[PDB]
Every structure is written in C-alpha cells, then in structure tokens.
Amino acid sequence: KRLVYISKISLEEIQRIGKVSIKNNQRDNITGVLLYLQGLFFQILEGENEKVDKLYKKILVDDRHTNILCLKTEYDITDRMFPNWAMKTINLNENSELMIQPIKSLLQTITQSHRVLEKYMPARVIYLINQGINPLTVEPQLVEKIIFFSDILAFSTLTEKLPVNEVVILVNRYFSICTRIISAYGGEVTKFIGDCVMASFTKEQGDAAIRTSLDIISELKQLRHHVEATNPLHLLYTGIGLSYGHVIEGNMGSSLKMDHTLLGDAVNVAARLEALTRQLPYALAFTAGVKKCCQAQWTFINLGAHQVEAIEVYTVNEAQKYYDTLQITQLIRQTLE
Amino acid sequence: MKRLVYISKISGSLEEIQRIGKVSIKNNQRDNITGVLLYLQGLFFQILEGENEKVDKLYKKILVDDRHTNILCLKTEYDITDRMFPNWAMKTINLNENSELMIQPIKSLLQTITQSHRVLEKYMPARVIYLINQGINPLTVEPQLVEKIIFFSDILAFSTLTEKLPVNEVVILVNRYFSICTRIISAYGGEVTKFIGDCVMASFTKEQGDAAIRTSLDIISELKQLRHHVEATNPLHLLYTGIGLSYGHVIEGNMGSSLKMDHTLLGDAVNVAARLEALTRQLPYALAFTAGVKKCCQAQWTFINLGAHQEAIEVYTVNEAQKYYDTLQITQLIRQTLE
Numbered sequence: 001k002r003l004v005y006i007s008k009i010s011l012e013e014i015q016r017i018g019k020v021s022i023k024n025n026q027r028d029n030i031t032g033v034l035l036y037l038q039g040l041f042f043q044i045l046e047g048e049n050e051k052v053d054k055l056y057k058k059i060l061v062d063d064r065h066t067n068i069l070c071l072k073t074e075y076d077i078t079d080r081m082f083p084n085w086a087m088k089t090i091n092l093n094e095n096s097e098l099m100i101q102p103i104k105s106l107l108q109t110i111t112q113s114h115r116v117l118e119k120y121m122p123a124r125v126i127y128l129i130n131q132g133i134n135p136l137t138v139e140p141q142l143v144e145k146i147i148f149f150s151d152i153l154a155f156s157t158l159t160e161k162l163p164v165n166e167v168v169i170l171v172n173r174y175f176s177i178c179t180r181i182i183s184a185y186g187g188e189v190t191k192f193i194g195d196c197v198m199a200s201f202t203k204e205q206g207d208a209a210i211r212t213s214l215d216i217i218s219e220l221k222q223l224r225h226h227v228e229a230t231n232p233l234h235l236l237y238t239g240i241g242l243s244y245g246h247v248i249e250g251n252m253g254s255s256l257k258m259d260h261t262l263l264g265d266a267v268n269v270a271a272r273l274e275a276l277t278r279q280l281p282y283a284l285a286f287t288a289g290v291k292k293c294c295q296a297q298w299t300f301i302n303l304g305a306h307q308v309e310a311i312e313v314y315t316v317n318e319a320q321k322y323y324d325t326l327q328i329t330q331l332i333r334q335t336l337e
Numbered sequence: 338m339k340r341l342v343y344i345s346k347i348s349g350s351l352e353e354i355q356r357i358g359k360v361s362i363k364n365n366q367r368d369n370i371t372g373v374l375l376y377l378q379g380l381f382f383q384i385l386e387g388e389n390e391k392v393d394k395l396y397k398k399i400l401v402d403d404r405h406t407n408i409l410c411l412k413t414e415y416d417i418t419d420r421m422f423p424n425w426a427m428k429t430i431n432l433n434e435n436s437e438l439m440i441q442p443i444k445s446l447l448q449t450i451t452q453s454h455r456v457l458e459k460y461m462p463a464r465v466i467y468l469i470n471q472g473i474n475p476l477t478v479e480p481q482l483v484e485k486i487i488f489f490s491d492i493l494a495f496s497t498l499t500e501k502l503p504v505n506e507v508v509i510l511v512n513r514y515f516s517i518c519t520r521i522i523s524a525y526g527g528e529v530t531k532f533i534g535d536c537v538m539a540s541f542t543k544e545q546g547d548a549a550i551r552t553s554l555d556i557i558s559e560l561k562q563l564r565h566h567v568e569a570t571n572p573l574h575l576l577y578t579g580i581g582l583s584y585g586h587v588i589e590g591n592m593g594s595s596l597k598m599d600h601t602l603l604g605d606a607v608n609v610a611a612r613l614e615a616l617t618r619q620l621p622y623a624l625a626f627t628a629g630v631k632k633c634c635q636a637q638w639t640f641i642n643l644g645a646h647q648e649a650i651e652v653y654t655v656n657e658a659q660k661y662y663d664t665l666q667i668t669q670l671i672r673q674t675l676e
C-alpha cells in the first residue's frame with residue numbers, strides 16, 4: 001500500500017534524516033518521496049502492506065516531527081508512483097526556480113489552511129482520515145455508545161456578570177481540561193455546544209467514562225484553589241451526565257454542510273442527567289446501562305427514578321460534593337458583586 | 338494594492354481552458370493586474386494582485402462565472418509591499434498536461450491536500466468559512482459579544498423513528514432534513530453552527546429578524562411538500578419539524594485548545610431557543626420565539642401571544658406557523674404507520 005501524510009516540526013539534520021531514510025528504505029524495498037516546506041513535512045511511502053506499516057509506526061513516535069495526520073491510503077495499487085526513489089528528499093525552501101514558486105506558494109497556503117481546519121474537525125473524522133477512509137462515503141452505523149455530557153454550573157450567572165475576555169479564558173480552560181482528560185482515557189469529543197461538552201465512549205470503556213468524569217471534577221477542584229479569588233477560574237464547577245444506548249454514528253448533511261453526529265435517545269438522556277446534578281448532592285449521574293458497563297468495584301449509589309417513562313439514576317460515592325449546590329450558585333452570584 | 342488567493346471547482350474541456358487565459362491576459366494587462374492561474378484535475382488555483390477597486394470588481398465577475406463553482410478565497414493581503422508575479426498578466430499553467438517527473442510529487446501532493454481541504458470545508462461552521470473568505474485567520478480572531486437570533490430545529494418524534502426505522506432509512510431521512518434546512522438557512526443569510534443529533538443550530542443577526550421567520554416557515558413548507566411528494570413507504574413521508582428562535586446576547590468565537598477547536602455561541606439565548614423548540618410539541622404551532630425576536634421584525638406579521646412559559650419568558654408565534662394537524666395524533670400516526 002501507499003500513504004500520504006503531513007507533519008509538523010518540534011537543517012543539516014533533515015539531510016541526515018534523508019541519508020538515513022535512503023539506506024533503510026532501499027533495504028526495505030519501500031520507495032517514495034519526502035518534502036519539507038516552512039516547517040512542515042510531506043512524505044509518500046509505498047511498499048508491501050506489512051512493510052510500510054512497520055515503518056510508519058517508527059516515524060509516528062519520532063520526536064522530531066509532531067501533529068501527524070495520514071491523508072490518504074490505497075490498499076491495492078496496480079503500480080508504484082516512484083519505482084526508483086528509495087527516499088528522494090526535497091528541501092523545497094532551498095528551491096529558487098520561479099516556475100515552481102507558484103505551485104510552491106499554493107502548496108504552502110492550502111496546507112496551512114488545511115492545518116487550521118484540522119483543529120475544528122471531530123476526532124472521529126480525523127481518525128477515519130488517518131485510516132485511509134473517505135468520511136463522505138463511509139456509511140453510518142448503529143453502535144452501543146456511552147454518551148458524555150458536561151457543562152459549567154451557573155453559567156448564566158457567569159456570563160451575566162463577567163467581561164467577555166474573562167468568560168473566554170474560563171471556558172477555554174474548561175474545554176482544555178475536559179478534552180485532555182477525555183482523550184487520555186480513550187474517549188472521543190464530538191463537539192462543543194455552548195458551555196456543554198459532548199463526548200462518547202465505547203461499551204468497553206464504562207469505567208473509563210466514570211474515571212474521566214471524576215478526573216474532570218477533581219482537576220476543576222484543584223484549579224479553584226490554585227488561583228486567587230479575583231480569578232474567574234475560582235468559580236468553575238461542572239455537572240456530568242452519562243448514558244448508554246444505541247446511537248447512529250456517522251457523517252450527515254449535504255454538499256453545503258457536513259457534520260459528525262450521533263442519533264439516538266441516549267444523547268438527550270445524558271443531557272438531562274447532566275442538568276439533574278444541580279438538584280443532587282453528587283456532580284455525576286448516569287443510567288443503569290452505564291452502571292452495568294462497569295467492571296471495577298465502584299460504590300454505586302442509587303439515586304432513584306427520574307423522568308426526562310422515568311428511568312433509574314445512579315452515581316458513585318466519590319462524586320459527592322463537599323459543598324452545597326444552591327449555596328454555591330448564591331456564592332457565585334454575590335461574589336460577582 | 339491587493340492580492341487574493343482562491344480555489345474553485347469546475348462545473349463540467351481542455352481547449353476551452355486556453356480561452357479563459359486568452360481573455361484573462363487581455364483584461365488583466367489593461368487593468369494593470371497580474372496573477373497566476375493553475376488548473377489541476379477539475380480544480381482551479383488562481384492568484385490575483387493589483388489595486389483594490391479593480392481587483393474586487395474583477396473578482397466579483399469570476400464569482401458569477403458559469404464554468405466554475407464552490408469558489409473559496411483562502412488568503413488576502415491588503416496593501417502589499419511588492420507583487421509576486423510582476424510580469425505575468427495571467428500565466429495559465431495546466432498541470433494535468435505537464436508530465437515532468439520532477440514535479441509529479443509536488444503535483445500529486447497539491448492535488449491530495451486540496452481534495453482533503455475541500456472535504457474539511459464541508460464540516461466547518463459557516464462563520465469560519467466566512468472568516469477565511471475575508472482573509473482573516475479564524476484562530477486569531479478574538480471572540481465578540483453580539484446580539485444574535487439563535488435558530489434551533491429538530492425532527493418531530495425522532496425517538497420513535499430511530500426505534501422503528503432501519504439505520505439506512507434514518508440516515509436518508511436525516512440527510513434530507515439537514516440538506517433542506519442548510520439550503521434555506523444559507524439562502525436567507527443565516528449561518529449554520531453545527532448539527533446536534535437531529536437538531537440544526539443556526540444564527541442570524543439582529544437585522545435578519547424577518548429572514549429568521551421566513552427561514553422557519555420555508556423549512557416547514559418544504560417538509561410539507563416533500564411529505565406528499567413521496568409514497569407512504571418512504572421515511573420522508575413522516576418528516577416533521579419544530580423550530581424555536583431566541584434573541585439575546587451571545588459570545589461568538591473560536592474556543593477550545595490545541596487538542597480541539599470549535600466555533601461556539603455562549604449565552605442564555607442558545608438554551609432558550611432549544612426549550613422553545615421543544616415547546617412546539619405542546620403547541621398548535623410549529624414555530625415559537627421570544628419577544629426579542631418579535632421586536633427584531635420589520636414585516637407586518639400577525640403575532641400570536643402564547644403566554645409565559647419556562648424565570649419565565651413570554652413566547653410568541655405567527656399565524657402562518659399554524660399546524661393543519663394535531664401534534665399528539667401525528668406522534669401516534671407515526672407510530673401506527675411503522676408496524
């Protein structure tokens with residue numbers, strides 16, 4: 001198979017890399033080309049399926065380049081594209097031929113624009129692109145997922161009594177903490193909806209979804225006492241709802257607008273449980289489906305049945321609030337006075 | 338002293354491309370405009386440069402050109418210090434016919450990254466695409482507090498349809514609903530934020546109050562036409578929508594971290610629009626908005642006061658949003674049909 005990917009750095013060393021790649025690829029019966037431009041690498045590799053994946057994993061863990069994204073993969077090609085170039089290194093910055101400068105300049109402009117759009121893509125779509133799968137042709141599937149929903153407590157009072165610059169810092173830190181912990185436990189963030197964070201886990205990650213929920217609550221608790229009382233981060237609380245059910249995962253829309261979405265009642269149920277945590281002594285609430293997806297010995301606490309066809313609500317004893325929810329909203333209210 | 342860079346997609350030969358350059362050389366040289374046009378596998382890559390008044394007017398005529406579509410300006414440089422191609426009125430480079438092997442890697446990379454770019458564009462929020470088309474990097478724009486009309490619309494009894502329809506049919510139904518909503522929202526100047534399940538999130542400025550209501554009624558209208566266009570075995574026959582609108586202060590911008598970025602709207606109006614959207618199940622109207630949206634309307638609509646619901650807010654609607662059916666019996670009609 002042959003693959004195409006772009007990367008990001010972290011000079012005579014890149015010529016040293018080219019010398020190293022020539023010797024290894026010629027030994028490995030693998031050909032291709034490696035380009036460099038303005039701090040970005042462009043490499044094409046081709047060979048037998050088992051051989052190129054062996055090499056692609058070596059460069060994935062390389063310290064020299066970062067932010068790797070496989071753009072394309074063709075598993076059954078008829079003939080190679082560069083049948084004689086073990087690894088042709090092209091330092092395109094050194095090239096000064098004016099006839100290639102337009103193609104050079106357009107390559108840099110689109111690639112830089114491409115690296116920006118990457119940051120807005122859902123993690124599932126980028127994953128599909130890394131696997132050589134076209135997101136516009138892949139059929140959606142019904143999967144058993146654990147839905148994650150979490151937002152900021154008393155966020156209406158915060159937006160009402162905080163400058164625009166302060167709330168942006170507060171939400172960015174909240175999104176950064178949530179995205180980092182969710183991704184660390186193997187979860188996938190779907191999208192941001194206002195101050196809400198939507199994520200999903202597989203049915204094997206039941207305990208990971210609860211550990212993610214507890215780590216997020218714990219990191220916000222650390223952050224609140226890391227800053228001074230004049231810092232908006234001192235008032236950052238969250239509630240977390242989890243649900244389990246059948247959802248349709250895939251890419252929807254038309255040629256004008258596409259999006260990665262999850263279709264199923266478990267999505268709405270997770271949002272209601274997230275809003276239910278305001279009336280509970282616990283900052284985490286999940287259904288029985290999430291509870292039965294857990295193998296670890298959690299101290300499950302039955303919170304009774306609530307209607308959002310009332311459904312059972314559970315939680316863990318570690319999700320207990322050391323504060324009072326209503327007194328915190330009042331504390332948030334009068335602190336901003 | 339302006340320079341533009343845009344990519345486009347062809348509409349539908351080789352020798353007809355040489356004419357575009359021939360005309361380009363005649364007009365760009367009389368306009369003192371230089372640039373570079375690249376054609377590669379059904380995509381156009383053109384750089385323009387020159388004075389503002391004549392680059393814009395030239396650029397506006399290339400937009401209405403029938404031969405290329407989906408034009409997106411990627412980069413803009415105002416008050417340039419020096420031209421990039423000072424001698425090329427318009428150098429047309431057909432990369433498809435060039436066969437130099439030393440540029441085939443660069444030619445192959447540019448094609449792959451651009452095709453991947455066109456795919457990512459479709460997933461982007463409309464505001465981000467708008468910012469790129471103005472030459473403004475979205476990751477450098479600071480979030481602003483603006484008064485906007487928030488748009489929410491989802492599918493009626495969507496939980497019953499997901500429980501009683503095959504996956505391929507649910508996808509066909511949702512794709513069509515998203516295709517109709519996006520087209521009507523965009524035609525009225527609205528910006529689609531994202532899709533949340535079966536919900537469509539959009540925003541309008543405070544000067545587009547009437548356009549937000551005309552969008553809502555046009556969506557409801559096209560769903561009615563579509564229902565009797567198809568047969569009773571088609572899932573589109575059971576497609577209904579409720580629409581909620583809200584007006585308030587929202588913080589709009591690019592938020593997140595290096596791991597994840599998203600275009601989001603922060604404000605109570607976003608949550609208000611979602612509840613009014615879900616309020617349409619208990620109303621004989623498929624559209625519900627607040628008094629703030631009502632005050633943004635200049636057209637002489639027949640507003641109907643639906644009382645106060647929930648910190649309570651007062652809900653309004655228009656007479657045209659009236660349903661010819663009953664919402665409860667439709668929920669049961671949808672369920673009895675899927676047997």
Ligand SMILES: Cc1cc2nc3c(=O)[nH]c(=O)nc-3n(C[C@H](O)[C@H](O)[C@H](O)COP(=O)(O)O)c2cc1C
Nearest residue numbers: 017020021024025041043055058059062064065087
């Ligand atoms: C951008 C980039 C591209 C690389 N491409 C190759 C390659 O094509 N083939 C190869 O053997 N090594 C390539 N390398 C080097 C690998 O990271 C790897 O460290 C090296 O091949 C073997 O290292 P080792 O001998 O210490 O095990 C590349 C490194 C970078 C940063």
Ligand SMILES: Cc1cc2nc3c(=O)[nH]c(=O)nc-3n(C[C@H](O)[C@H](O)[C@H](O)COP(=O)(O)O)c2cc1C
Nearest residue numbers: 357360361364365381383395398399402404405427
């Ligand atoms: C991709 C593309 C690029 C074009 N670039 C130019 C250009 O740079 N200059 C120009 O005068 N016309 C350009 N045209 C053609 C114009 O749209 C149009 O034919 C011309 O400006 C007006 O010609 P007319 O007055 O004879 O109708 C381009 C057309 C296409 C499809």
